[PDB]
Structures are given as structure tokens and as C-alpha cells.
Amino acid sequence: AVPPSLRLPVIEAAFPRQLHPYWPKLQETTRTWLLEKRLMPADKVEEYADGLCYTDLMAGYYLGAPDEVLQAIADYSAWCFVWDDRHDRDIVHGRAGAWRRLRGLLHTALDSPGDHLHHEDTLVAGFADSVRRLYAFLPATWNARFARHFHTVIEAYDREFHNRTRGIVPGVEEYLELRRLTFAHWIWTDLLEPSSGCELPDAVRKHPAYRRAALLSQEFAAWYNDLCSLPKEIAGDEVHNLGISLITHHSLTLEEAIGEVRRRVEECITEFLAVERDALRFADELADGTVRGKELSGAVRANVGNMRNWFSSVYWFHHESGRYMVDSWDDRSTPPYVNN
Numbered sequence: 001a002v003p004p005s006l007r008l009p010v011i012e013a014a015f016p017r018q019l020h021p022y023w024p025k026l027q028e029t030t031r032t033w034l035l036e037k038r039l040m041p042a043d044k045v046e047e048y049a050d051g052l053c054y055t056d057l058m059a060g061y062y063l064g065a066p067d068e069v070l071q072a073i074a075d076y077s078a079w080c081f082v083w084d085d086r087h088d089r090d091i092v093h094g095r096a097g098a099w100r101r102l103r104g105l106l107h108t109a110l111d112s113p114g115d116h117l118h119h120e121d122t123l124v125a126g127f128a129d130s131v132r133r134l135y136a137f138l139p140a141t142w143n144a145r146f147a148r149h150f151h152t153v154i155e156a157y158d159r160e161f162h163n164r165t166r167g168i169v170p171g172v173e174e175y176l177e178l179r180r181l182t183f184a185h186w187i188w189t190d191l192l193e194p195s196s197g198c199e200l201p202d203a204v205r206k207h208p209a210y211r212r213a214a215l216l217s218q219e220f221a222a223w224y225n226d227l228c229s230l231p232k233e234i235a236g237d238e239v240h241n242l243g244i245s246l247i248t249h250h251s252l253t254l255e256e257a258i259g260e261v262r263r264r265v266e267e268c269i270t271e272f273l274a275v276e277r278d279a280l281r282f283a284d285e286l287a288d289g290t291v292r293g294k295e296l297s298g299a300v301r302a303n304v305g306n307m308r309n310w311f312s313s314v315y316w317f318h319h320e321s322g323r324y325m326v327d328s329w330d331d332r333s334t335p336p337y338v339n340n
């Protein structure tokens, strides 16, 4: 049961939740990876890792993924959360030097992950381990695009560092552009392809219906995170959240801002339902009779299915994960699972 201010009946009724059969193993393997790569303190992994639900979130998303592919995606996903925590703590403690160095190392590791598998910074070595494995599934053309996309994500984190250091809250439109990067829209979109076993040609994945379906899936996920993570983020002096930009620049009250974010999230859903029809008509057009057309048709169909699955996975993740349960913390500004 979800709180009325967070509840989305259309999700509950029309996007039934899915779970990949590898999830029980996935849960433990990622937990152990976090442990052995020293990405989270050992006692924090035992106390909090399972309750954080990072593996549940990916296992509800990339349905159909080879077990190995889902494992690398889940390790990378968990790493991303730990990176978000590190970024947060570097900002809070004014470690601009340590953040700048991490940022540079991540850019280099991204292009040559093999070189960085045993780097002395365990956050960098962990990144490189997951990225090296992601690079093993599809041609190097897909790897180059993932890298291009993630260099942009790191730089958006650097922009957030600048904003929070200066006490700047982005305008609403500026925020919406930044959020496509800090949420890593195009990374989750990229990872649809190794999950269905096919790198999509530019002409296919840039078709308007595929692009728009892919975008709305991510806008929904990012803004729903904004809605649900607003309490802990206000508490932690986070300034990046659609709700916070509206309060700051459109002078809404908190209640008005929650309402406005809800309405924007709702519209993503019914916009997605419209363009999903087009995206699936496109998948049928790809099935032209040929082997390649059938491969491409099947892959777009799977990808669009998972774009849909993201809605329910993200929806339930925010109600299940301890990441957001600020009311339970001794210090509302310092989550228990973060290394402070």
C-alpha cells in the first residue's frame, strides 16, 4: 500500500510488476561484490545492503537479460548509488580536491577500465570492474557510446558539485536538462541493448517513437525519484530536485510543489502509453521478413517492454528501499548507510 501523496493508480493497475528469475542470486552476488570490492563498510553491508533494494530495482527492469549481463548491470547500479553517496559526502565535507581527483580518474577508467581494475582507490577499481564487464557483451561501437554518455554524467555530477558548493538551485528548465544527465537517462537506455542481446543501429534507436518512449520512461523515473526522495534531500541540503526548483523559483509551497511534481509524473505515464503504441508499431514494421529484421524487431519489442517495466520497478523500489526512509534516522541529514 502506497501513501496517497505518492500513489499512482495507473501504475498499480496497468503496469504490473515483473521480476527476473535470477534475482535471488543477484541479491547476494552484488552484496558480496560490494563487500569484496570494499565499496561499503562491512558492517554497513550486513546491516543495510539487502534493505537498500538496489538489485530488486534492476531485476524489475531488464527482464530477459542474460544472467551475466544482469549481474554486471546490478553491480554497476549499486556502484552508482555508492558514488552518489561519495559525491554527497565530498560536497558536505568540502573535499573539492578529492572530488576533482575522483572525477578525473573516473573519466580515464571509463575509457580504459582494464588499466584501473586494481587501482588504489577502491571506488575507482569497483567502477572499472563493472564497466570492463559491461564492455564484454556487444561490439566496441556500443562501448564507445556508453562511454560518451557516461563522460557526460560525470560532468553533470561535477556541475552539481559546483551548484551545491555555491548554494545555487537550478531554474526549473535548467534543472530538467541537468536531470537527464544526473539520473543517467541515456545509460539506462543504452543498457537495454546488452539486455536483449543486440546493439541497435543509430537509425533504429533514433527513430522518433523509440527515442520518445525511452525518454518518457526515464523522465518518469527521475521525477518520481524527486517526488519520493524530496524529504531526505531537503534534510540533507540537496538542491537538485524538481520540487526544490519549483519552491525556489516559482515560489510554490511544499504542498503545491509535491502536487506539481505528481502531475508531471502522471503525464509521463499517459504520454508513454500513447507513444508506446507507436514504438510497438515500429517494432512490427522492422519485422520485414528477414532474419536481421526479426532480430531487430524482437530487440526493440523487448527494449520497449523494459522501458515499460522501469515504471513499475522504480515505483515499488521507492516504497521498499531503506535509502529514502529519513524518518527512521538519528540524523536526518546523514543516512545510516553512508560512510561519513
Ligand SMILES: CC[N+](CC)(CC)Cc1ccccc1
Pocket: 057, 077, 080, 081, 084, 182, 183, 184, 221, 225, 314, 317
Ligand atoms: C543516485 C542513483 N542514480 C542511478 C542508480 C543516479 C544515476 C539515480 C536513481 C535513483 C533511484 C532509482 C533509480 C535511479
Ligand SMILES: [Mg+2]
Pocket: 084, 182
Ligand atoms: Mg545524485
Ligand SMILES: [Mg+2]
Pocket: 084, 088
Ligand atoms: Mg542523491
Ligand SMILES: [Mg+2]
Pocket: 225, 226, 229, 230, 233
Ligand atoms: Mg533523489
